[PDB]
Every structure is written in C-alpha cells, then in structure tokens.
Design a protein around this ligand. Structure first.
Ligand code: HEM
Ligand code: HEM
Ligand code: HEM
Ligand code: HEM
Ligand SMILES: COC1=C(OC)C(=O)C(C/C=C(\C)CCC=C(C)C)=C(C)C1=O
Ligand SMILES: COC1=C(OC)C(=O)C(C/C=C(\C)CCC=C(C)C)=C(C)C1=O
Lengths: 54, 53, 49, 54, 423, 105, 446, 57, 146, 54
C-alpha cells in the first residue's frame, strides 16, 4: 500500500485532486469551478484582513 | 408522461394516506399557530385567552 | 441438547401487569405502551415550551 | 446565445433610468427571458429530436 | 355420498401426439405437457442443455414476456414447474378451474414459442451452479449420477445436471436447437386434470402440431458396466451396486419390481426394525450399528438398472455390501418363499395405488405412460400384471443380477469399500 | 413519396450535417443521453456493436479533446448511419411500460 | 364444464359421529381404492410439567414397538405384509398415529390403531433402548439450524409457560423418565373425549362406526371424573434470544408477534397478508419479477438464501411472522425490508395484491387437500381444534370477504406497534438491536 | 406401471417458479435416520425442504 | 494444485494411476480438494516420524567430502522408529477414468502393467519405449525413427 | 437497500450517529465529547447574535 491512498485525511485529497478519474476532453469552462474555489478563498482572506480595521 | 401513476391502485393508495395527510396538516397548522401566537386564529379558542380583549 | 436452553426468569424485572404466566399480555399492552409514550409525549411538550 | 444576449440587454436596461425606450424594451426582454427558458428552449429540443428521427 | 366418477379419455392424433384428460370435479386444475426430451437426448457437444432449459421456463416467449409469465401466473395463484428425468421433461401448470385458459396459454408459450434472448440466457447461467449445488448436497445424487455414467456409455450416462465445464457455456442457439428437435408432436403428450377432452384436443390441434425433429426413444443406451469411485471423508459411505435388468413395459420389468419388494425398498413403519426386509435383516445380522440398505430399481425405455444401495460407516462398507450381495445370491439360488413374493406383491400394489392417490402422482403416471407406452393402463390391469409375475420370474431376475456385468458408484472414505473385482 | 418527402428528407439531412457528430465519426446512437432505459440497451448490445461503440466514443472524446475533427471523407454519412441501439432501446421501453401497466391495477 | 365455485359444493360432506365414550369418529368418503386411518389426540407437550417434558415424544418411540396382543415386532410384520404404512407425529398441542393402507384393509388398520393407542407394552428393555435413540435424535436436531431457531423462538416468546417447551424435552428428562412417568401421562391424556378416529377414502361411514365400537369400546366409559384439567393460557412475552456462533456460515432469524389462536376468525386475513409477502428460496425461477416486493428485492439484491412467512396456531395464542436464512452482512437489510412490508400492509395495503393473496390462499387450501392422507389429517386436527370440519365452501366464503381494508385493519391489530419475539442463531453480529427491531414495528410517516 | 421415477429408484429433478428445486427419487436413507447419526445441514449454502404452496386457514 | 493442473497431462496421469492401482501408487501427488484445509499438524508430525527414518533415507552430496557427509549422517540422521520397506504393495487392478472437458484436444493414455525398476525386464521396456518413440530429437521434425 | 445507508449525505450521518458500533460500557465521562459539541454551537449562536450589536 501507499500513504496517499490509505491515510484517512490524505484519502480525501487523493480522491478529489490526485487520482480522481476525470474526462480527457473537458475544456476551459470547466475551470470556473476551481476559479470559484480561488475566489472564495481570496474573498475570505482579504475579507479577514479588512475586518482587522473595519 | 405522469400517466404512470394513474390507475386503481394509485387511487387506492391516495385514499389510504388521506387521514394521515389530513392529520399531518392539523399538526402543521396548530404547530404554526401556537409557535407564532397567531392572534387571529387563537382568539377563538376557549382557554388561551391570555390577550384579554 | 439445544432443548436444555433455558430462558432465565425475569420476574425480577417484569412490570407487575406482566407477572403471570397464567394470562395474556395483550390486555396490559395498551396501558404499558400508554404509560411509556405518555412519558415521551409530556417530555416533548416540555421541550417544546 | 439569445439567452446570453438577452441577459446583456437586461443588465444594460437595469443600469438605465425607467423613462423612454428603456421601459418597453426592458419589459419585452423580461418576457423573452421567460419565453426562452420556459417555452422556446424545450420546444427546440423536441424539434431537434424529430429532425434526427428520435 | 361421493359423486360417481368419470373415465379418463385418451386419444392419439395422427401426428403421434397423445392427449389424456380426466374430469374429476376438483376445485383446481392440472395440465402437463410431457415431452421425450430428458438428458439422454444430449450428446458430447451439448451436455447440460436440458438443464439450462429446465431452469429457463420463465424467460420471455413470443406472446409473453418473463415479467408477464411471473406476474400473470402469480396473480391467479398458480404454479409452473418443470420436472426432468433421463428420459422426459414435463411442464406442469396448476391453478383453479376458472383460470385454466391463461395458464394453458403461458404453458404453450413456454414450450412452443421460447425466444431464449442472449442477455436473459446469460443472466440465467449462474443458476445452474446454485441449482446443481443444492441437489448435490444429498450424497445420493452424486452416487446415482456416477452410477449412470459408469453403467452406460451413452445416453443414459448423461447427467441430469449440467457438467461444471459447461456452466456458462450453453448457448441460446443450443437451447433453440434442443427445443426444435425434441419438442415435437410425435414426442409429446398433453395431459389434463380438471379440464375437458374437447378443450385439450382443440388446444393440441391448434398449437401442438409441430414436427420436424428427431424420431424415437434414443440413440440406444449401450450398457457397458464399470465403476466410479469418489473419495470424500463423510463418515458415511454411500454405495450402489447394480446390473442391467429390463426395459420398462416388458413383463420382466414387473419381475424386477417384485424382486425389489422381496428384498426391500423404503420403510413402512416409523423407526421400525424393518422385519419384512430381506436385505436389511441380512446386513443387520452381521453389522452392528448405523446403516441403511435398499434395493434399487431403475427402468427405462430400452434398458434398466437393478440392484441395491447401502449407507454405512466407512469401515463396515465392505461387510454391508458383501452381506447384501449374498442375500440376493440366496434368492438367486432358489431360497425364496411364496408368502414372501405374496408380501412383496402386496407391498408393490399397495404402493402403486398410493402413488396415484393425488393429482400430482396421477398426472405424472398418466403422462409417463403416454410417452413410454402410448396408452393408459388402468390400476386394475396393472394389479393384474403384477399378479402374473410368478415366483420363478423373481428368482430369474435375481439370477440375472447375480451373473450380469456390474456397475457401481460409491462416495465417502472408500478405504474399506470393495471394487467389484472383490465382490 | 415525391417532392415533399425529399424536402423533409433533405431538411433532416441538413440538420444532421449541421449537428456535426458525423465530423467526429460518431453515429447518432453514440450521442444518446444515458438514462436507465438506455443504460440497459447498451448492456444488451452484442459483443461486436458494443466494442465498436466504445471505439467510436473514444475516437470522438480524443478529437473533442484536441478540438480537431475528422477529414471530410471519414465523416459519417447520413443514412449510412446505422441506428444500432434503436431496436434494443425500443424493447427495453416496451418492457418498462408493461411493468408500469401492471403497477396500476 | 363446472366452475371453481361449483366444485367446492361437490366435495362430500365429512360425516361426524360420536361413540358412548367421547371418541368422535369422522370420515370423508371418496372413490379411491386407498385410504388413511388414524387417531388424533389432544395430547402434546403444552400439557406437560417440566419434569415430565418429553413424555409423549418418548411414547411415540415406544408406540410401534409392541402391544400386549402383538409383542416386540409382530405389529410391524402385519402392517408391512399388507403393504400399509404406519406413521406418527407430535407437536406442542397434538399427537397423531395414522395408517395409510388399501381400502379392504380398513378392518385390520383400525384394529391395529386401537391396539397401539390402548394396549401399549412399554417394556423396560425397550424403554431403555429408546433413551439412546432419542438422545441421538437430539444430537441430530441440533444440526438443523432451522429447528433450533423455532425452538428458541418458542422458548423466548412463551418464557415461563408450558408452550416454551420443545416437544422432545431436555436431555436430563430423556435419561430419567421412568415407565411410571410414561404410564401416568398415558392415563391422563390418552382417553376417549380427547381422541378422534379419522379416516378418508373408499370407506362407508358405517364401517368406521362399526369398527370404532368394536375396537375402541373400553375407554372413557368407566373412567373420566376427577383429575381431568383444562389448558391454562400462555403468556406471550416479546423478547429476544441470540445464539451467536460465527462458526456456522449462514444466519438464521425468526421474528414474530403474538397471533390469536386456532378459533379466531381473523386467521384468514392474516394468511392472506402472509401470502402477499409469501416466500423465497434461491432455487425459485423468477427473481426480479416476483410479485412480492420482499421476494423481489431479496432476489435482485441477493439479501437471503430463503425466507418464509408463517402463522403458527395454538389454543388461544400463536406466532405470526417470518423466518429467514442469510449471509452475515445481510441480516440488517433483510429485517428492514421484512418490517417494511408488514407496515406497508398495516397502513397502505392495496386491492390488487389482496386478490393475489386470496388467490394464493385458495390454491394452497385445495392443493394441500389432495390425497387420503392430508384430508384424514385435516379431519382429525379440525375436530380437535374446531369441533367441526370446516368445508371448503366456508373457507372460500371467509377468504372471499377479505378486501384491502380488512388486511390493513387485521395486520394493524397484530403487527402495528407490537413487541416481537426474536430468535437468532449463527453469525448474528449484524442482527439489529432489539430496540431497533421494536422501532421498525411502527412508522413515523403514519 | 410406467413412470420411471415413481417406479421408485432413478432420479427426478423439479424446477419451479413459485415452488422449490427438488431432487428426489429412490435409494436408502430413511432407515438410517432410525439407526441414527444421520446428520444434515441446517441450511448451509442451501434452499429449504418440505416446500411451500400448501396451508389452510 | 491449480498451477500443476493447467497442463492437461497432469490430470491424465493422476487419473491413470488412480485407475490402474487400487492402492498406493493410486494416490495422487496433489492433495484431493476435499482435504485442502483439513490436513493437520499432527498428521504432518506422524508422516515425518514414520517415514523420515534412517532405513528409508539417503544423503547425497556434490562438491562436499565423504567424511563430512558421513559425520553429519552419524550425528544427525540416526532416526529410526518408523515403518519398514517399499510399500503396502501396489496391487495393479486396471480400469479406466474418463473426464469430459471440451478442450478441442483429447488427451489419452493407454497402459498395462509392466516391470518393477531394477529388474532386467525394466530395461526391455525402456528399449521398447525407444523403438516406439519417446520425445523428439529434432526441432520441428517429422520424427522419422518414431 | 435503505436510504440512510446509501445516500452520500446521510451515510456520513449514519456512520457517525446511527449505526456506529459503540462500546456498551462507556460511562458519563464519555459525554463530554458531545457536550463540547453543544458548547461549540452554543458559543457560535449566542456569539453571532452578540455580533449583530457589538
Ligand atoms: C461557491 C459557488 C460554486 C463553487 C465553489 C463551485 C465549485 C465547483 C467545482 C469545483 C466543480 C468541478 C469543476 C467544474 O466543472 O467547474 C463544479 C462543477 C459543477 N457545478 Fe459548481 N460551483 C459553485 C456554484 C455552482 C453553481 C452556481 C451551479 C449552478 C446552479 C453549480 C452547478 C455545478 C454543476 C452542475 C457542476 C457539474 C458541471 C460538469 O461536470 O459539467 N455550481 N463546481
Ligand atoms: C468571511 C470572509 C469575508 C469577510 C471577513 C468579509 C469582510 C468584509 C468587510 C469588513 C467589508 C467592509 C470593508 C470594505 O468595504 O472594503 C466587506 C465589503 C464587501 N465584501 Fe466582504 N467579506 C468576506 C467574504 C466576502 C464575500 C464572499 C463576498 C462576496 C463576493 C464579499 C463581497 C463584498 C463586497 C461586495 C463588499 C463591499 C464592496 C467594497 O469592497 O467596498 N466579501 N467585506
Ligand atoms: C473542540 C474540542 C473537542 C471536541 C468538540 C471534541 C469532541 C469529541 C467527541 C465528540 C468525542 C467522542 C465522544 C467522547 O468520548 O467524548 C471525543 C473523544 C476523544 N477526544 Fe475530543 N473533543 C475536543 C477536545 C479534545 C481534547 C482537548 C482532547 C485531548 C487533547 C481530545 C482527545 C480525545 C480523545 C483521545 C478522544 C477519545 C476518547 C475515548 O474514546 O475514550 N479531544 N472528542
Ligand atoms: C464565531 C462564534 C463567536 C462569535 C461570533 C463570538 C462573538 C463575540 C463577541 C461579539 C463578544 C463581545 C460581546 C461580549 O463581550 O459579550 C464575545 C465575547 C466573548 N466570547 Fe465569543 N464569539 C464566538 C465563539 C466564542 C468562543 C468559541 C468562545 C470560547 C469559549 C468564546 C468566548 C468568549 C468570551 C470569553 C468572551 C468575553 C466574555 C464576555 O462575554 O464578556 N466566544 N464574543
Ligand atoms: C474533474 O473535474 C474537476 C475539475 O476539472 C474541471 C476541477 O478543476 C476541480 C477543482 C476543485 C477544487 C480545486 C476544490 C475547490 C473547492 C473549495 C471549497 C476550495 C474538481 C473538483 C473536479 O471535479
Ligand atoms: C461512541 O462514542 C461516541 C459518543 O458516545 C460517547 C458520542 O456521544 C459522540 C457524539 C458526537 C457528536 C454528537 C458530534 C459533535 C461534533 C460537532 C463538530 C458538532 C461520538 C462522535 C462518539 O464517537
């Protein structure tokens, strides 16, 4: 066995961003899901720093 | 294409569940009434006249 | 030999309405569920409040 | 594409005062939005199926 | 005050089909289509085809999908069962009087318009393995299957259960071929119970006129002899010793049946010593503890296997077998009474009459008779035929067993089980 | 038969060409959306057709990935377009509909 | 051609007649050349003490091993020589001894039955041989998981009552029961008003009567009086017995609510509902398409090897439920589906399925009453439990009256929110906890 | 007196839709449950004996 | 056992022996299926104690010296308390075993009792074997001398 | 199959609070895990309402 595949925490990562079987032909348009992911974190991070003075 | 659920058995099914769907609605109503203190609906109940007029 | 398998006496734990092997349990069943459900009904009424 | 184009119209109108042109075009675009999604797009699918003999 | 009965009506159509019906004024009805299509008609290239077929009675037909067959029959609370022997396949269908019509239709559809769809047949293959495992938990089934494999080189040698290597390999085309060439008019019989002759005769003339298959009762079973031995460790050894006897229908067959009762078939008393059983008392005398024995008698269209079957602890096998064999020898040397044959005759007659007491037993007897003989022989004449068997006929059958080339199958821990050579 | 039928036939041929699955060597039945009825029909296909269907889908997904398309001569021609799935799908639906009728009584 | 309905009327009325004893003699004459005669007795194990238990099972073993007029093995020799078959059984509530023989042989068959049922020779050497035989049978019965679970279910459902006992008794009783014990049990129970001579086939009822007076006259006449008790009711409990044994490869589970006794009219509606649920076994053809949803879901999802619904009847009580056999990881799904079906029927039973239930039941009734043997048994048992013979036409009438409303009312009464008796054996780690099985006996939807 | 299987001896399998798979002709067994120690499974990879589609009220 | 049994020859020769002898040589070189999982530690112990004894043993060496092997044998191989000779005695019986298969190719072996090894007759059989034909000598040859 | 056991979302619940095999003998002392759970939510809820005026 591996470490990625078996560890309770890493499993989740592995099954979602590493070994996840993805279609070979998805195009940009499929990128907006990860981009929303980034926008969500970007909104939270700059949002927190603003809350430190607002 | 909801013609799948049209027939004698489904008609029998609907009836068997009516007293239950009806009693569930009585639960939902009294439950809504008692939880918001529905003035309009409550004032008619004999006791529970804790709003005098 | 599986015929030796006793069933331990539970009189020590049985509600009074079910203490007689001589008679039905069906009679006291309603009162018995009644009592136990009243407890949970009163509780939910309490929690609701 | 007419839905996306209709949504440009809607935002453009939305950013404009409720005076001349703007009222009736923004009124018709609203109807179109719902005529498109609710009636036109489905009808097209049925037609397309038919053209394919499906 | 019971109603005066009715006679069975019997009819051979010119195409060879036989129709027999009895109007018992019963609440239920029973219709069976008996066909000469048992495992003996299989060959080296298609073994197990009649097994999968037997398991395929509810697959889709023209005129009736699988779902319909199942739901339709269950809606009226009836049955559809298929039963096979090395010679026949019998499709029986059961239901109350008022429902004969729909059941008849499903029957006709299953037997004359099967579609054997690729995917439905693929899904059914695993059932052979479940079906075979369940039969094979009775040690008797292995034994009798090996007994037949050992005795014949041919057709009767085939098994009633699909060989393992064929599970998953029998094809839709092989099922189609098996039906087209065996399920034909000249190889068929439509028996009815609780129906009327005109109706069965109408049905047969409209739907059972199929013919273009093979012809008679065989390729001809060539009795050969030999032995099959299966090491097992079961604490109990099962063994069967047999020799060629007589084909069913012949006078000699009845002699063998009477011999079977002189020696001993099943028991008559719950937990009894089995006093009137020659084989049993003969083994018991010199063997102390767990054992069973019984004469075995199988009769077919062109052959027969008669002898005995023993169950015993691994170490007593030799003794049990030898005691049993010697007991038969004793009758072959003339040591047979007259009241013994008389008792055997009574055991045989009482049992046959008992065998057709019910609808299921009656219908099967009528169906098998129709196939084997093309006739219906009333209980009176069967009783008459049994009576014609003389003591010397029984003695002669025993003598035939003793000197005929033997066949034997045995399973268990065989360390003390003799080889024929040693009998 | 005449002028009109050919006109509806040429409109159908026109849509077909416009639809563009042909450009990726696909056949019409390779584009069907997979619901249960369809999933079952795929299952019921014989070995050969099933294998051909996977190769076609693979050939297309590959093309679709690099956003290319097949040379014009290898496009599937309309009405040379074998509807291999249809008979299976039809029967699976027919089977479901019978279950459905029985479920009403 | 006659209709089904008409055919029910054609069945000859079962003739009932009483002796100056209490011995009821009943027969159903047919046209068959074979017949079945027997004696049904209101003696079982629900009549036994505790020290005593196994008494009748013990008598059954001795019954065919010698009488005073026919010693050691002489009886066997007579039965076998006429080609007849002699058998016997015993439940918690009934004992039977019956001969299956040629019609001419009726005189001898009754004569033998009489000798066996009265002049029994419980000879010391034989009663001593039988203790080894019965103990071996106990060892054998232990290997039958199914027999074990139904004995467990009885033992838990009927906890401190005589009904918790098995027919064969505990091993300690088998090795200690004396001839005195047996003789006393015989004296108490094998007496005329508690027995019924039953027959079926080619016999005229007068023959049976003559024979009954000829060979049974000599029982209860100068007898009865003080020492004849009735049957006390048996409290149903509602609990669980789990015999965990991971060595066995399939789990056996039996669950049941308390049913009403033999007498109750509502056994018919229960049998209809049970029929709707039906039975399954891995050798049934038709998997996915089976009508019964339990059967169908069990076959496709492979949730079991077999299952069967049942409705066992005793004096004023009974066990109503189901039994199943499955792999260790399927006990939970199996229970869920089983319970799901009971509630569905309790609340939402539909008409079409009720007709199927009624139909399955009409076929079962008639298919079973086929042959002199099941009918003779039916006559004997009926008279012990019903006092009458209930003609098929009446059972039909009772079946015909059942509609969906009755099913959901009658199932509700027995199943809805009631405590089950649960018995498990084998790999039962996944047998749901009792509280959860109890919470599956009602529904929050409803 | 035909009916090979009922003439007692040769084997006869039954398959069914609602009833159970049977394998059951003649050989000894019955007089081995008496001189005992004739075990049996209790539904080891099996089915079920006695079978069903018979009853009463 | 599965790996050995993929060569059709192994089934054949195992059945050939089962068919020919009623005894000891009839046994298979591979465990019968019904015994897999059932052979016990006590049965292994018993098999070793009664067969792995001095009178039934031979220590052969290659690239070692006689004194060393002889020392080893005198120190460690002096075990005796088992059985005695070469058998219970194989009783040749004869007969045939047939396994239906569908393999496109039929494998068959026909044999009769011949002679025990060591006897002069055994060599006659070995010469007969070569007159008739054992394996091939030429890659892809007609096998002229066979 | 059930609904609790198979549904992606309910599985998680089932595997954590319904069918979870728990030791039969844990005592109060094992309650503090759920009590911390309650305290965490109680702190968040009253904490949010305070933030609406703080
Ligand atoms: C916080 C907002 C959202 C986030 C973080 C989010 C995240 C994602 C991610 C990571 C994917 C997979 C990659 C991809 O196809 O882009 C995805 C696919 C998808 N999302 Fe979202 N998304 C959000 C809003 C939406 C919205 C607004 C919808 C439409 C109501 C939506 C419906 C879908 C669907 C149907 C898919 C499957 C698309 C496909 O596989 O072709 N999600 N999303
Ligand atoms: C929990 C993470 C977030 C925190 C702590 C946060 C906090 C704040 C604070 C303190 C302000 C006032 C300061 C300012 O106006 O620049 C603000 C403004 C705003 N935030 Fe957030 N926010 C967060 C996530 C979001 C999200 C998810 C969105 C939606 C995309 C969002 C969109 C806005 C907008 C539109 C404004 C007002 C426009 C402006 O920047 O002036 N923020 N936020
Ligand atoms: C936000 C704070 C915490 C939460 C919500 C939390 C929640 C839980 C829950 C729900 C359980 C299971 C039930 C129980 O035994 O109580 C548990 C068990 C456990 N927790 Fe925590 N806990 C928290 C803080 C801690 C701390 C501070 C520790 C010690 C460093 C800890 C170590 C453990 C351990 C070892 C167990 C296993 C105990 C056993 O099974 O006997 N957790 N916790
Ligand atoms: C995100 C959820 C929470 C929010 C929104 C929140 C918000 C607040 C706010 C606005 C105050 C100032 C108002 C006041 O003093 O009463 C406060 C005080 C405080 N909170 Fe929280 N808090 C949260 C969770 C917590 C947690 C996890 C703790 C740790 C147990 C905590 C412990 C405290 C304490 C000790 C005080 C000061 C004592 C006091 O109440 O005066 N709160 N919180
Ligand atoms: C195979 O299809 C997929 C992609 O290719 C189009 C993605 O790119 C992503 C990317 C998702 C990320 C990085 C998680 C972000 C979510 C949060 C809450 C931060 C997912 C899940 C996916 O399934
Ligand atoms: C078998 O042992 C366990 C218990 O018995 C002592 C519990 O009571 C709980 C209770 C945990 C809950 C309700 C979840 C709360 C967590 C959050 C983030 C709200 C868990 C997990 C457990 O494993």
């Amino acid at each position: 066995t591996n470490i990625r595949k078996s560890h309770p925490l890493m499993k989740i990562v592995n099954n979602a961003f590493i070994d996840l079987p993805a279609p070979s032909n998805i195009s940009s348009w499929w990128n907006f899901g990860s981009l929303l992911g980034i926008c969500l974190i970007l909104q939270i991070l700059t949002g927190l720093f603003l809350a430190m003075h607002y | 294409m909801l013609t799948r659920f049209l027939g004698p058995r489904y008609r029998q099914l609907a009836r068997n569940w009516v007293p239950t769907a009806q009693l569930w609605g009585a639960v939902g109503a009294v439950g809504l009434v008692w939880a918001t203190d529905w003035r309009l609906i409550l004032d008619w109940v004999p006791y529970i006249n804790g709003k005098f007029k | 030999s599986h015929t030796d398998i006793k069933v331990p006496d539970f009189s020590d734990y049985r509600r009074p309405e079910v203490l007689d092997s001589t008679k039905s349990s069906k009679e006291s069943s309603e009162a018995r569920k009644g009592f136990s459900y009243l407890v949970t009904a009163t509780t939910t009424v309490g929690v609701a409040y | 594409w007419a839905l996306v184009a209709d949504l440009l119209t809607l935002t453009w109108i939305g950013g404009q005062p409720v005076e001349h042109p703007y009222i009736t075009i923004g009124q018709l675009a609203s109807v179109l939005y719902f005529l498109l999604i609710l009636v036109l797009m489905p009808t097209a699918g049925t037609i397309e199926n038919k053209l394919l003999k499906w | 005050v019971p109603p005066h009965p009715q006679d069975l009506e019997f009819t051979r159509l010119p195409n060879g089909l036989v129709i027999a019906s009895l109007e018992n004024y019963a609440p239920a009805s029973r219709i069976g289509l008996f066909i000469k299509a048992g495992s003996r008609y299989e060959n080296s290239n298609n073994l197990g085809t009649s097994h999968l077929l037997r398991l395929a009675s509810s697959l889709t037909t023209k005129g009736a999908s699988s779902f319909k067959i199942t739901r339709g029959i269950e809606a009226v609370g009836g049955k559809l069962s298929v039963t096979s022997t090395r010679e026949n396949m019998a499709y029986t269908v059961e239901c109350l009087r008022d429902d004969v019509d729909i059941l008849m239709e499903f029957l006709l559809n299953v037997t004359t318009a099967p579609e054997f769809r690729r995917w439905e047949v693929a899904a059914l293959q695993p059932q052979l393995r479940i079906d075979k495992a369940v039969a094979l938990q009775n040690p008797q089934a292995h034994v009798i299957e090996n007994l037949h494999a050992a005795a014949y080189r041919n057709a009767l040698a085939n098994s009633l259960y699909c060989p393992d290597y064929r599970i998953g390999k029998v094809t839709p085309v092989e099922l189609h071929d098996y039906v087209q060439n065996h399920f034909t008019s000249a190889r068929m019989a439509l028996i009815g119970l609780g129906v009327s002759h005109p109706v069965l005769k109408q049905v047969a003339e409209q739907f059972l006129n199929i013919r273009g298959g093979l012809g008679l009762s065989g390729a001809k079973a060539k009795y050969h002899g030999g032995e099959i031995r299966e090491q097992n460790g079961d604490s109990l050894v099962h063994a069967a010793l047999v020799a060629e006897s007589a084909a069913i229908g012949s006078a000699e067959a009845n002699a063998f049946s009477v011999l079977q009762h002189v020696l001993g078939a099943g028991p008559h008393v719950k937990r009894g010593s089995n006093a009137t059983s020659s084989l049993y008392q003969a083994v018991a005398k010199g063997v102390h503890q767990p054992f069973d024995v019984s004469a075995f008698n199988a009769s077919y269209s062109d052959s027969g296997l008669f002898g005995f079957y023993t169950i015993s602890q691994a170490a007593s096998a030799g003794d049990v077998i030898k005691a049993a064999y010697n007991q038969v020898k004793t009758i072959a040397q003339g040591n047979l009474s007259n009241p013994d044959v008389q008792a055997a005759k009574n055991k045989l007659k009482a049992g046959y009459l008992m065998s057709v007491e019910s609808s299921e037993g009656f219908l099967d007897e009528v169906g098998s008779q129709a196939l084997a003989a093309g006739s219906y022989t009333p209980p009176s004449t069967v009783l008459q035929q049994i009576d014609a068997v003389a003591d010397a006929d029984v003695i002669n059958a025993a003598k035939k067993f003793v000197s005929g080339r033997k066949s034997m199958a045995a399973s268990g821990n065989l360390g003390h089980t003799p080889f024929i050579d040693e009998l | 038969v005449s002028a009109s039928s050919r006109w509806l036939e040429g409109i159908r041929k026109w849509y077909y060409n416009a639809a563009g699955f042909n450009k990726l060597g696909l056949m019409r039945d390779d584009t069907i959306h997979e619901n249960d009825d369809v999933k079952e029909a795929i299952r019921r296909l014989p070995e050969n057709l099933y294998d051909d269907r996977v190769f076609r889908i693979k050939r297309a997904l590959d093309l679709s990935m690099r956003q290319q398309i097949l040379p014009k001569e290898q496009w599937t021609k309309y009405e040379e377009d074998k509807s291999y799935l249809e008979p299976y799908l039809k029967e699976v639906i027919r089977e479901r509909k019978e279950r459905e009728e029985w479920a009403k009584k | 051609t006659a209709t089904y309905a008409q055919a029910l009327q054609s069945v000859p009325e079962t003739q009932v007649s009483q002796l100056d004893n209490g011995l009821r003699v009943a027969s159903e004459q047919s046209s068959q050349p074979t017949c079945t005669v027997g004696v049904w007795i209101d003696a079982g194990s629900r009549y036994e003490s505790e020290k005593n238990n196994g008494a009748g099972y013990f008598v059954e073993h001795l019954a065919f091993k010698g009488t005073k007029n026919r010693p050691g093995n002489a009886l066997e020799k007579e039965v076998e020589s006429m080609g007849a078959h002699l058998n016997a059984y015993s439940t918690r509530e009934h004992t039977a001894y019956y001969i299956k023989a040629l019609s001419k042989d009726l005189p001898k068959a009754v004569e033998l039955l009489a000798d066996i049922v009265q002049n029994c020779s419980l000879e010391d050497s034989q009663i001593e041989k039988e203790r080894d035989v019965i103990l071996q049978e106990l060892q054998e019965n232990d290997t039958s998981m199914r027999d074990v679970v139904f004995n467990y279910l009885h033992a838990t459902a009927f906890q401190g009552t005589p009904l918790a006992q098995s027919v064969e008794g505990p091993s300690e009783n088998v090795r200690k029961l004396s001839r005195a014990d047996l003789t006393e049990y015989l004296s108490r129970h094998y007496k005329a008003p508690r027995m019924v001579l039953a027959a079926a086939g080619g016999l005229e009822h007068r023959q049976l009567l003559d024979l009954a007076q000829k060979h049974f006259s000599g029982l209860s006449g100068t007898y009865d009086e003080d020492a004849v008790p009735t049957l006390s009711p048996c409290r149903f409990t509602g609990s669980q017995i789990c015999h965990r044994e991971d060595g066995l490869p399939l789990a056996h589970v039996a669950i049941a609510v308390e049913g009403p006794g033999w007498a109750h009219p509502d056994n018919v509606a229960l049998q209809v509902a049970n029929a709707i649920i039906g039975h399954y076994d891995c050798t049934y053809g038709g998997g996915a398409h089976l009508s019964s949803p339990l059967a169908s879901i069990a076959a496709t999802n492979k949730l079991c090897q077999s299952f069967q619904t049942f409705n066992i009847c005793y004096a004023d009580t009974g066990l109503l439920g189901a039994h199943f056999v499955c792999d260790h990881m399927s006990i939970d799904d199996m229970m869920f589906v089983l319970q799901g079906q009971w509630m569905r029927l309790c609340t939402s039973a539909t008409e079409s399925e009720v007709l199927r239930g009624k139909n399955l039941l009409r076929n079962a009734l008639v298919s079973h009453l086929d042959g002199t043997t099941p009918v003779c048994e039916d006559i004997g048992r009926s008279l012990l439990t019903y006092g009458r013979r209930i003609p098929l036409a009446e059972w039909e009438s009772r079946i015909a009256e059942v509609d969906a409303r009755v099913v959901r009312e009658v199932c509700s009464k027995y199943f809805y929110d009631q405590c089950p008796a649960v018995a498990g054996f084998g790999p039962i780690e996944q047998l749901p906890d009792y509280n959860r099985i109890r919470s599956g006996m009602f529904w929050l939807r409803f | 007196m035909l009916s090979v299987a009922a003439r007692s001896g040769p084997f006869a399998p039954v398959l069914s839709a609602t009833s159970r798979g049977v394998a059951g002709a003649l050989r000894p067994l019955v007089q081995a449950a008496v001189p005992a120690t004739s075990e049996s499974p209790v539904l080891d990879l099996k089915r079920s004996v006695l079978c069903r589609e018979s009853l009463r009220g």
